[model samples]
Target: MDQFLVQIFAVIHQIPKGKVSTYGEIAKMAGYPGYARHVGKALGNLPEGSKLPWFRVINSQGKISLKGRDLDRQKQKLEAEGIEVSEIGKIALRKYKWQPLE
Candidate 1:
């Protein structure tokens, strides 16, 4: 169970401050490029009280996942690192997307 999740989790962990990547990106980084859907599943299954920097992961269009208060929570975290979060919880990939060297 964890082996599948653990791979994606580690990939999400690599997202540094002030930068974010897509679920598809994490899937590829974990060697499962076609398994983007599972990336979100892995994050959701994080151990209780986990602090895995999951907020740094976003959608392919650079939009965030949560909304309402939780959306603000993610927004605030990114703001702390200098990334701007739009009122609609959308992020500008042009400005803050993390494209690691391949």
Candidate 2:
């Protein structure tokens, strides 16, 4: 695995269930500032059977960033965790966002 991506994954693995984080926040925590897009790309084509909490991640807008089946799955998983995803795939970031730093 790419060292940069591994670092990002490490940060991702720390996200607790029922809590969520953003690509920007995850990037910062992974020691890469302003690298949110890389985090997105890394998750976009995740390896099969990978156990990272990809579902617990959303865009900085507090919304799921996927479409079709991917979006549906994310919504389902988030709802499974007791987080409400709005009709447009929006989550209340202030209510469910993970803030390990602050």
Candidate 3:
């Protein structure tokens, strides 16, 4: 993996269960500010059955970027881990956002 992808995964790995981070937040934590889209792309390109908890990364608005069943799956995954996403798929960032160690 590229170092950028490495950094992204490294930071993402630190998000404990039941919490979440934004793509932009992960990008910043990975030392690549303004690369939020790149972060999403990196996660999207992961091979099948990859172990990273990519679902823990959402948009800045605390919303999943998927739709229909895919979005439902993401929300279900989070809820199964004790992170309660609202019925509208909105997570309360102030309450559930992950604070990464610097």
RMSD, one per candidate, in order: 2.1, 1.6, 2.0
Worst 10 residues of 3 by lDDT: 41-50
Please write out the lDDT profile of model 1 over residues 1-102, one tens digit for every residue.
Answer: 667687887877778778889888888888888888777766655543367877788777678766677678778878888988887897989978796875
Give me the runs in candidate 1 sitting further than 4 Å from their true place.
45-49
Which of the two candidates, 2 or 3, achieves a greater lDDT against the reference? 2
Candidate 3 Cα outliers beyond 4 Å, as residue runs: 47-49
User: Best candidate per lDDT, number?
Assistant: 2
In model 2, the worst 10-residue window by lDDT is: 46-55
- Best by the TM-score measure: 2
Model 3 residue pairs with clashes:
none
lDDT tens digits, residues 57-97, model 3? 88877788566776777888888878877777888888886
TM-scores of all predicted structures: 0.85, 0.91, 0.86
Whole-model Cα lDDT of every candidate shown, in order: 0.77, 0.84, 0.81
Superposed Cα RMSD, model 2: 1.6
Candidate scoring better on lDDT of 1 and 2: 2
* lDDT, ranked from best to worst: 2, 3, 1
Clashing pairs in 1: none
